[PDB]
Design a protein around this ligand. Structure first.
Ligand SMILES: O=C(N[C@H](C(=O)Nc1ncc(Cn2c(=O)[nH]c3ccccc32)s1)C1CCC(F)(F)CC1)/C(F)=C\C1CC1
Lengths: 99, 100
């Protein structure tokens, strides 16, 4: 147990709409976690948008997954005590050339 | 002041190498922050890699910036007390068609 005190008081999305692998944001809620709200990226298409503005299945949109840390209420339902925990989240999409 | 207790004991770019907007990782260190080490994505090219494996400058690789939370030592140098803080980090790269 390495217990520390944390003060939770903290003191373009239209540019990425031009991506060849565009994505939408999905709101992910968990009342036993801090942050309770996490916005997850979901690729709009299986393929990538080509030079003509059409979805081209010769390339694939893939989510960029990142490991992040979240606070898990410990004991469960605790409003003021937590344990650090690792989860995988989608932070955007990229276009890849298949194998 | 919204002070909570946190147990820091966790219970426990090469993947996307085929991207048309590939990136490398850059190590960012700050001893006054938790995590002290943060890996930032840097786009390998200004343009995007086409089907032939050549860089095409009619499209741009752009870093995807996201707001993440970090712990800032408060008071400075404190080993056991922090304040939650927002920072902007580059999490990967995407290929965009420029504003024409
Ligand atoms: O920020 C969120 N969580 C914070 C966090 O994980 N910070 C991180 N910094 C660096 C991290 C590792 N890493 C890199 O090196 N490059 C990254 C690029 C993208 C993502 C992670 C990256 S992970 C926690 C919040 C609780 C805390 F304050 F106790 C400890 C920090 C969070 F939960 C959600 C945000 C996606 C909305």
């Amino acid at each position: 147990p390495r217990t520390v005190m944390v003060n939770l008081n903290i003191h373009s999305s239209d540019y990425y709409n031009r991506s060849t692998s565009p994505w939408n944001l999905h709101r992910n809620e968990d009342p036993e976690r801090y942050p309770s709200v996490i916005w997850e990226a979901k690729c709009r298409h299986l393929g990538c948008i080509n030079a003509d503005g059409n979805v081209d299945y010769h390339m694939n949109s893939v989510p960029i997954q990142q490991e992040i840390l979240v606070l898990r209420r410990e004991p469960p339902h605790s409003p003021n005590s937590f344990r650090l925990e690792k989860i995988l989240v989608s932070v955007g999409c990229t276009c890849v050339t298949p194998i």
